[PDB]
């Protein structure tokens, strides 16, 4: 059943699994019209599909076009998300298909389960964890590739950059969720912390700066200090 605090280290075993976050599939801006009513304007989206073992990110970019002529968009977004996951599983060799797909929002259980009926041995699981994958669009390179796109389009990254060369998936994942929690809580702050030292840069096939072990310990503590600051400042504690 549900991924929680108990069954956490299963993310890191040798069973192939993908996380799916659908929170940035359907994005809009809200504006006042000429007559003074409200309207939305859809913008480019993305499905977030992650293998937490390898760090392999299957970012399906969702072009505004897909919404044209459709009702119940927020509901459609979940079925579109499930179709795109299904297509990605079908395109992979049998030995690479995942045994589990963990969705971050219970509302994706039914769409995905219906779309994966051809994969009876692939369990669709929810999670009880409050995972910060919605902050994915606060990563400059991911936002840029999403907002620049002019058609549907699949983009590949390793969201752990090359860290697995030096640390384990468990640690890599913790660094990731810590970085995303910071980004989610206070984007401006988190990004200031990450880019202050202009001499540490971002390799072209990477998403985060090329920090040293010593420099990651600095950053991780500053992100934690930043998460705590914004908490006590928001519950006046």
């Amino acid at each position: 059943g549900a991924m929680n605090s108990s069954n956490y280290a299963e993310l890191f075993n040798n069973d192939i699994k993908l996380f799916v976050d659908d929170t940035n599939v359907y994005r809009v801006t809200v504006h006042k019209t000429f007559e003074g009513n409200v309207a939305t304007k859809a913008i480019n989206g993305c499905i977030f599909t992650l293998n937490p073992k390898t760090g392999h990110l299957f970012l399906k970019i969702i072009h505004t076009s897909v919404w044209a002529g459709q009702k119940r968009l927020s509901q459609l977004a979940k079925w579109k998300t499930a179709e795109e996951v299904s297509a990605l599983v079908r395109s992979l060799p049998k030995e690479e298909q995942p045994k589990q797909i963990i969705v971050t929002r219970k509302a994706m259980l039914d769409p995905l389960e219906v779309h994966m009926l051809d994969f009876p041995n692939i369990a669709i699981r929810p999670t009880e964890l409050r995972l910060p994958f919605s902050a994915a669009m606060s990563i400059d390179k991911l936002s840029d590739v999403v907002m620049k796109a002019t058609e549907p389009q699949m983009v590949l990254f390793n969201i752990y950059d090359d860290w697995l060369d030096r640390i384990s998936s468990y640690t890599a994942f913790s660094r990731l969720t810590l970085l995303l929690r910071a980004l989610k809580t206070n984007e401006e702050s988190a990004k200031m912390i990450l880019l202050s030292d202009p001499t540490i840069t971002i390799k072209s096939y990477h998403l985060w700066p090329s920090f040293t072990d010593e420099q990651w310990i600095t950053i991780e503590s500053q992100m934690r200090d930043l998460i705590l600051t914004e908490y006590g400042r928001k519950y006046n504690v």
Binding site: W79, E83, D110, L117
Partner: protein, 300 residues
């Protein structure tokens, strides 16, 4: 007016016939039921005064043969049997009536309850669900699992109900995943009505049979199958205007017949809130909404 005589009542037992029931004391001189309306299927059922696991019964139509009940002290239960000898049968029946050892099927003449709960239930469809084609009658109890319950063990003692699954290839046309799951019209109209049942009367017959097996035996599977056949219709945008009209009738008499105190084990909160208030058919089961809101307001 037909008869199901009894050889004796060895053991204390509460006997049921259709929606009626009476207590028979151990070795009270009881010798059966007379005046059973010809033209409908019936069900005789037993719960012994000792344990309440033993809730067992037989579906029968006396237009198929001469049935009697004899207690078998090895298997330890009231068994239905068929007398092939017309002469010996009519002879024992007349004897017991003259003696006056038979209770009368107690039918108030304005009362159409049984007819309304069995209108589309035909023995032959029953014998295809309780496979045992060496009897004209059909045995059912509290425990018997469904074929769908075996998949999610003993295949001879199964209820072979039609398999309904809203998350199956049968219910979902590839490329229509969203469309078919939110609006089950395909799964109902093409696949089930036209595909498997043939007409709305066989569907309604199953739905009806499922309910009675649920209510008379507290059979969990039959109840799952009842709720599923309802949900399928309620979850379709496109239903024959006659089917909607008939279902509202069928469900009215089912909710009406239900003992007040078993509401909490026989009714699925979720399916009913969906049917009456969420689904396409919220505005289409007027008689069902009225008796549900007046008899079981707590469940909505």
């Amino acid at each position: 007016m037909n008869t199901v005589p009894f050889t004796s009542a060895p053991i204390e037992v509460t006997i049921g016939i259709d929606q009626y029931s009476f207590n028979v004391k151990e070795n009270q001189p009881f010798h059966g039921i007379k005046d059973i309306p010809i033209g409908h299927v019936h069900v005789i059922h037993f719960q012994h005064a000792d344990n309440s696991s033993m809730r067992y019964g037989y579906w029968f139509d006396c237009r198929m043969g001469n049935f009697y009940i004899q207690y078998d002290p090895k298997d330890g239960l009231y068994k239905m049997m068929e007398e092939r000898d017309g002469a010996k049968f009519e002879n024992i029946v007349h004897n017991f009536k003259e003696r006056q050892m038979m209770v009368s099927y107690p039918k108030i003449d304005e009362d159409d309850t049984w007819y309304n709960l069995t209108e589309f239930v035909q023995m032959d469809k029953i014998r295809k669900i309780v496979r045992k084609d060496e009897n004209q009658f059909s045995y059912v109890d509290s425990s018997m699992t469904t074929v769908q319950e075996n998949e999610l063990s003993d295949p001879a003692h199964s209820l072979n109900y039609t398999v309904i699954n809203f998350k199956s290839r049968e219910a979902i046309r590839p490329g229509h995943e969203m469309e078919d799951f939110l609006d089950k019209s395909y799964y109902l109209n093409t696949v089930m009505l036209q595909g498997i049942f043939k007409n709305s009367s066989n569907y309604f017959g199953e739905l009806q049979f499922a309910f009675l097996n649920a209510m008379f035996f507290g059979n969990y599977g039959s109840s799952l199958q009842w709720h599923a056949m309802i949900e399928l219709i309620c979850s379709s945008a496109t239903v024959p205007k006659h089917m909607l009209d008939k279902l509202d009738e069928i469900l009215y008499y089912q909710i009406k017949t239900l003992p007040e105190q078993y509401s909490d084990i026989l009714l699925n909160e979720r399916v009913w809130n969906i049917c009456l208030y969420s689904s396409f058919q919220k505005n289409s089961l007027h008689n069902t909404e009225k008796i549900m809101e007046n008899k079981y307001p707590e469940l909505l």
